[PDB]
Amino acid sequence: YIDPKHLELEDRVVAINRVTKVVKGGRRLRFAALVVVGDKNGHVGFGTGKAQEVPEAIRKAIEDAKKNLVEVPMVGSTIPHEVIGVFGGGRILMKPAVEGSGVAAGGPVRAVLELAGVADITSKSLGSNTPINVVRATVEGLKQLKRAEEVAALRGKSVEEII
RNA sequence: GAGAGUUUGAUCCUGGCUCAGGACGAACGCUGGCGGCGUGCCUAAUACAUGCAAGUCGAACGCUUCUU
Ligand SMILES: CN[C@@H]1[C@H](O)[C@H](NC)[C@H]2O[C@@]3(O)C(=O)C[C@@H](C)O[C@H]3O[C@@H]2[C@H]1O
Numbered sequence: 245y246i247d248p249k250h251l252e253l254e255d256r257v258v259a260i261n262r263v264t265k266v267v268k269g270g271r272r273l274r275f276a277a278l279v280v281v282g283d284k285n286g287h288v289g290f291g292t293g294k295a296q297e298v299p300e301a302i303r304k305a306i307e308d309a310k311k312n313l314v315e316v317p318m319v320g321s322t323i324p325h326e327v328i329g330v331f332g333g334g335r336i337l338m339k340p341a342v343e344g345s346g347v348a349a350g351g352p353v354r355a356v357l358e359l360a361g362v363a364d365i366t367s368k369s370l371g372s373n374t375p376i377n378v379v380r381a382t383v384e385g386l387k388q389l390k391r392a393e394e395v396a397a398l399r400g401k402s403v404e405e406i407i
Numbered sequence: 408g409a410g411a412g413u414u415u416g417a418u419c420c421u422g423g424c425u426c427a428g429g430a431c432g433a434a435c436g437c438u439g440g441c442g443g444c445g446u447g448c449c450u451a452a453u454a455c456a457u458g459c460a461a462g463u464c465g466a467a468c469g470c471u472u473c474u475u
Pocket residue numbers: 268269
């Protein structure tokens with residue numbers, strides 16, 4: 245668990261989807277907002293908020309995202325190793341990149357990575373474009389990412405021996 | 408190793424279609440200052456006026472026309 249407090253979190257509105265519930269009189273229109281809130285230092289989360297008005301949906305989503313913050317391993321400006329994250333339709337593949345290459349990624353993955361604070365990475369989305377699913381798939385891949393120190397500790401060998 | 412639009416009242420998935428890039432012996436439209444380097448019948452191996460694109464050797468040979 246990562247406490248939102250003590251972290252200077254900033255948010256970005258990934259998607260604002262106007263959803264409809266059909267009611268006897270007609271259409272009941274609501275706004276569903278997907279938000280990604282991150283620390284630019286390795287912590288990031290995503291939250292969903294539904295409300296009659298766009299600002300309120302965004303605010304609800306922001307609070308949810310803070311609750312869901314997670315930490316991403318990072319070696320320099322890029323991730324430790326290649327990782328594929330799959331959630332539902334979403335399917336993302338993210339690879340380390342050389343320094344200065346930038347963030348090669350599309351749409352929602354861009355927000356997740358920027359907010360997380362990763363500056364250089366290569367990513368490809370092999371699944372659907374559904375923003376919620378791709379964001380979920382992104383965080384799944386990041387949770388798969390492993391630290392050299394943790395791996396070295398787990399396997400019982402020095403990190404130098406591992407590499 | 409970037410995506411985006413579009414099926415629905417709304418949603419996820421599947422799925423096609425379309426677009427954002429680059430390329431060219433290009434052509435067309437509008438427009439048009441210069442220079443360097445390059446390229447220019449992709450079609451009818453269709454038909455071709457005209458001129459030229461294969462001559463040279465007198466130290467292999469015998470002739471023949473003029474200059475004093
Ligand atoms: C018989 N009275 C109806 C009934 O109460 C409906 N709710 C069950 C009620 O529904 C509404 O309140 C609605 O929300 C829909 C609207 C077409 O009619 C409205 O009035 C509707 C009332 O007129």
